[PDB]
Subunit: 95 residues, 6 copies
């Protein structure tokens, strides 16, 4: 199935590293970037579930190594419900 994978960091450089490592690690596309305040930012990828699993693992490993990198929360959703797309910005850049 298609899945989305999410890494939320405290800090911008770490979220950029999470995104870069995710898209380089597996066949996924970066589709979202969400800011919710308090320094919390999330990047969202989409692809086949196994690919998303590989990408999220790579992104966590990489973001942890950033100078001042802080990973706050991570999650994968297989088969996200279609209602989510038009309410939550998880798929903003998916076409």
């Amino acid at each position: 199935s298609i899945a989305v994978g999410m890494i939320e960091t405290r800090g911008f450089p770490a979220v950029v590293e999470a995104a870069d490592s995710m898209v380089k690690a597996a066949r996924v596309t970066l589709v979202g970037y969400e800011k919710i305040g308090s320094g919390r930012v999330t990047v969202i990828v989409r692809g086949d579930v196994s690919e998303v699993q590989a990408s999220v693992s790579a992104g966590i490993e990489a973001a942890n190594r950033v100078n001042g990198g802080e990973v706050l929360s991570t999650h994968i959703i297989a088969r996200p419900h279609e209602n989510l797309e038009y309410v939550l910005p998880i798929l903003e850049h998916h076409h």
Copy 2:
């Protein structure tokens, strides 16, 4: 009825929303950000469906790595004045 789950953190709120819409016959109608990392998702449906959905959404958001549920509430017959002031029904048509 309207059901609301507020989390600290975005991944947890997404999981709350996904689990809510998959658990019962409810529509996700709102997403509100108020700072301090606090985000709320809002669903609408028959009260029994909303009750089922919110329970499922809490259970799922609690299991998210770094998931933090902050507040949850169900309102059965929300007053019509709320619709056009508060973004609880943004995507209800």
Copy 3:
């Protein structure tokens, strides 16, 4: 006199419950919703002063019972000065 009543909560679900309970408790209209950050949100009602007093009391009681509900500050202003309307968003939805 006409008054405005305000309940500020930390958290969105509690502010929605405050608003709902306020408009159901008395002859008031919900006229404002203000976000100032740090999780602080305020709802504002308008009506005859005695009605606003009843509504604010009901809203506090209800918002306190919300799971994770936190009431931060509450206040009633009788006869708000007309200068306030066009500077502060207390009466946004009053027509």
Copy 4:
């Protein structure tokens, strides 16, 4: 002159503004949000009126349930360069 009261919390800032405009001959000209729950209201008038207004506004905002006054200041003859950079005079016409 310009007089400013900054509070933590919205209800308290509204009460500061109301009490200021009712206490003396000043006009409420600004409302500024800067995060951390900090909000400022700004009035303009003759300096003696502004002084009276700010004193009344502090006394009233202190009495608000959960009211928190954070900072207050009066500037008598603010430099004209400030007008078009800082939102101290947004509603002054």
Copy 5:
């Protein structure tokens, strides 16, 4: 040389006093006002370096005397690189 001078405060009244005292103290113009959250606000002046030094010293002294005034950070840059102007809002009101 032309320089920019910056005073960042926690709180709005103190930043207004910093700006006023800066423009009154020396031959500088107020050219920027930046908000970055958490109550942190910065005002930016421009002028000859010696004038900017005098202005920043005056602004610090004044902002420290504000009731609830908190100066967080201050800095002067002589000859700011031209790349900065169109990325960072340090010179928004310089014409």
Copy 6:
């Protein structure tokens, strides 16, 4: 390559940016605000230039009165997908 310095505080981020562009052949291409007083500046250039620039920017931002460097990172060959999702290259033409 892309180089990033994130500070707590605006004056420090400006000094990081100025020192970076003056230290080597890099262009300042981004400025991102994410709350909690955290701001990041982003430069682009050949990796060796970026390395020189980030080192200079850290050293300078550390010396700012009330300067606080929070996080720094260099990415050598950022993936093209990042460009149109993240504001790392806003001013790169």
